[PDB]
């Protein structure tokens, strides 16, 4: 009868061997034309291996896969031309190769991630799978870059992605975090996943005024409701946290009369004069405005504004001396004829309610019955004789004088001076 060299053969195959790979040849001995056949084998044996009925060579006819089957049991029956038969078994062991990529499973991503999250806030939960065995299935993760995110390993194949750095939406509003996982096989395989992080806003920025303080000039006699300035503050926060409202909180004026002077539009920051300013009553006043955001809690800043009321020429000069008659004339009839040049006949005394050039007075002769007999001090308003009185000079003299300010246009007052020389 036929007989195999032994009952049980053992071979190992790498899962990556191509179809048609030589597994083993088994032969029985007539000591002839013997037939070989599988018997009592699994269905997958018939589907993976080919047994030469005449030669007894065994080859694969399809691809292997350690993840699907780690071993095969092959029973071969040898039949000579007679009825007798013999059997042997071949236990085929499959070897694991690194042919399965690691995969990364990310859940519970903190979306969005508040910018005030404490150190150690759990952003995401990470889990790794690897269908291979042993080292080929041993996966480890790490984060690329140094943007402030660290992987904490709670147990094997489980990670927590945590912050280790204070966040700031105003500096970095979005993050792309790449987590890479690699196995420890030969050669190693790796995969990666990109976690996108949206940093949500917190009201952590107070409004800031565009200027450290405000110096405003407003011409006197302005209409009420005249826009005199516009404050502006900025706030990098989002939405309600960056919405600014302006207001007036303090002033060196009477608190009950503050609204009667100035206001500010709460949305535009335009500052209005609520009344016609009068430089002669008040030259300047101080003001403290506030910019406030609409966050919880609110943030604010304070800025000082000074308003300078500008002088206009709204007052004409007025003569205080000499006293004038209803016709605007004054009489000086005791002027001695022997008066030496420089004799002070009289002095026009005028005042002006304004300031600066608007109240800088100058005195002019408009009409003279004898030009050059009398002089008129341009700035003093002193009326003096300029030359010795002559024999052909009239006893009665008349001057029409004007006191003007230095405004534009110049306002003035006039007076007629009857100067009458007395005979000795
Ligand atoms: C985080 O990453 C995403 C996605 O980026 C994509 O994948 C990466 C691995 C890289 O290969 C990138 O090059 C790739 O875009 C960024 O999203 C943004 O996606 C759009 C989609 O096309 C990118 O292109 C724009 O698409 C519009 C669509 O109409 C075009 O009109 C634009 O002209 C533009 O091309 C966009 O570039 C991309 N932004 C990037 C790469 O910065 C996401 O922005 C990124 N986050 C950060 C903070 O960088
Ligand atoms: C800006 O100033 C505001 C004014 O509030 C009042 O005035 C001052 C003089 C203090 O006495 C203050 O306590 C009063 O309530 C404040 O309300 C506000 O907090 C200030 N903001 C900043 C950023 O300083
Ligand atoms: C192909 O090669 C293998 C090498 O071991 C043999 O075992 C087989 O029988 C066939 O000759
Ligand atoms: C997975 O990603 C790593 C990145 O380090 C590569 O080196 C590797 O070859 C595979 O592409
Ligand atoms: C209101 O309007 C005046 C001009 O009329 C500006 O000067 C002011 O700043 C505010 O915008
Ligand atoms: C005044 O200017 C600030 C910027 O400094 C703006 O935020 C504001 O809207 C106004 O234009
Ligand atoms: C004084 O001067 C002004 C102009 O300077 C006149 O308008 C006024 O009537 C007076 O003569
Ligand atoms: C001075 O003179 C002018 C010109 O006559 C008058 O208008 C004024 O009232 C004052 O008498
Ligand atoms: C001063 O007074 C005389 C009249 O006495 C006027 O003629 C002159 O214009 C000014 O008013
Ligand atoms: Ca496989
Ligand atoms: Ca494998
Ligand atoms: Ca693997
Ligand atoms: Ca911030
Ligand atoms: Ca913010
Ligand atoms: Ca804010
Ligand atoms: Ca005035
Ligand atoms: Ca004035
Ligand atoms: Ca004046």
Author numbering: 209 to 239, 245 to 637
The paper states:
From these experiments we obtained crystals of γA4EC3–6 and γB2EC3–6, which diffracted to sufficient resolution for crystal structure determination. The resolution of the final refined structures was 3.0/4.3/2.85 Å for γA4EC3–6 and 2.3 Å for γB2EC3–6. The two structures are similar overall (RMSD of 3.02 Å over 405 Cα’s), although γA4EC3–6 shows a more pronounced EC4–EC5 bend angle (32.6° for γA4 vs. 18.6° for γB2). These are the first Pcdh structures containing EC6, which displays the classic beta sandwich fold, but with a large insertion between the A and A’ strands. However the γB2EC3–6 crystal structure also did not reveal any interactions with clear biological relevance. Since γB2EC3–6 forms a weak cis dimer in solution (80.1 μM), this was unexpected. The monomeric arrangement in the crystal is likely an artifact of crystallization, perhaps due to the low pH of the crystallization condition (pH 6.5). Furthermore, O-mannosylation is observed at EC6 G-strand residues 624, 626, and 628 (γB2 numbering) of both the γB2 and γA4 structures—on the opposite molecular face to the mutations that disrupt cell surface delivery.
